[PDB]
Amino acid sequence: PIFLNVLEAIEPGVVCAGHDNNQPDSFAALLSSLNELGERQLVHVVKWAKALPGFRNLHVDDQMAVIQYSWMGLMVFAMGWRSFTNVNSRMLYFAPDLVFNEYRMHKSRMYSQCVRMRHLSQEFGWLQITPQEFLCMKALLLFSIIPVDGLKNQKFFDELRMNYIKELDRIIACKRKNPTSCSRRFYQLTKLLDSVQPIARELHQFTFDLLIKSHMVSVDFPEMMAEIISVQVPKILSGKVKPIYFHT
Ligand SMILES: N[C@@H](Cc1cc(I)c(Oc2ccc(O)c(I)c2)c(I)c1)C(=O)O
Ligand SMILES: N[C@@H](Cc1cc(I)c(Oc2ccc(O)c(I)c2)c(I)c1)C(=O)O
Ligand SMILES: C[C@]12CCC(=O)C[C@@H]1CC[C@@H]1[C@@H]2CC[C@]2(C)[C@@H](O)CC[C@@H]12
Numbered sequence: 001p002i003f004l005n006v007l008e009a010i011e012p013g014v015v016c017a018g019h020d021n022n023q024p025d026s027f028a029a030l031l032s033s034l035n036e037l038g039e040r041q042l043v044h045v046v047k048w049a050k051a052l053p054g055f056r057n058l059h060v061d062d063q064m065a066v067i068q069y070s071w072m073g074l075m076v077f078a079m080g081w082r083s084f085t086n087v088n089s090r091m092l093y094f095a096p097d098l099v100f101n102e103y104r105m106h107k108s109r110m111y112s113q114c115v116r117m118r119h120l121s122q123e124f125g126w127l128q129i130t131p132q133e134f135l136c137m138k139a140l141l142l143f144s145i146i147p148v149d150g151l152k153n154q155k156f157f158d159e160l161r162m163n164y165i166k167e168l169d170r171i172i173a174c175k176r177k178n179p180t181s182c183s184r185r186f187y188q189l190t191k192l193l194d195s196v197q198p199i200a201r202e203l204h205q206f207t208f209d210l211l212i213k214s215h216m217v218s219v220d221f222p223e224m225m226a227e228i229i230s231v232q233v234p235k236i237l238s239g240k241v242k243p244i245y246f247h248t
Contacts, residue, residue: 039222
């Protein structure tokens, strides 16, 4: 189908972080690389979003809003996928040049968060998530977080989102044969998507605090990276911007 072709086509390619694996794994060096990777990934996310069906129909302000609020969840989701299809979730495959092993997970001073990220990665396994489900779920994540007071034009966003959820449906009901597994599959996926929010929330908090102490730990934050984390992220940690959960 058309929709499925677009998603597969606009799917971003490999992206390096530019990490110098020749230097010892120090906290400053590791995170500074993750921020750079984030900055770079942000560029591919914006283009990816613009090329998304119906995205260019939202108010220009909302387009930048939804992107600045869910960039974390998206990247984290895609990261788990790579880790799953690249190294069987054994390690966090952030980038071909920035892979995290047990040691690095500790050195990054955010081991626990990595554990959850890996749990998310492994999820792609037991749930036998197909490439089609992944693409659709990831896109649906773009419309998974907005301000409590709605966007510039909620009416459209609600319909755009609704139209993306129906896609997930068609996808889910494009191979099934029974009414049981089909209705259950939707439950499993919607749950998987919701499990992403909690993780992104911890990373949002961590990066925020890291930015504030950036100069005290010698960690560098790219331009756009520091501008979003100091303006958009705070809105989420303060409760002004909240994620959209399928379940309670
Ligand atoms: N020119 C591109 C799209 C493109 C459009 C815009 I407005 C951009 O501005 C920013 C700057 C910082 C941010 O955090 C965000 I989100 C967006 C960028 I960077 C790229 C294309 O045509 O694919
Ligand atoms: N289901 C179709 C693709 C299809 C996907 C989506 I997201 C749609 O949502 C809207 C709604 C209002 C808009 O202005 C725009 I632009 C898109 C529609 I309408 C159709 C296919 O598979 O060919
Ligand atoms: C989104 C990124 C970078 C892109 C990716 O593959 C997932 C990964 C998850 C951890 C993020 C990192 C970007 C930089 C952050 C936000 C650090 O400041 C702390 C947590 C890091």
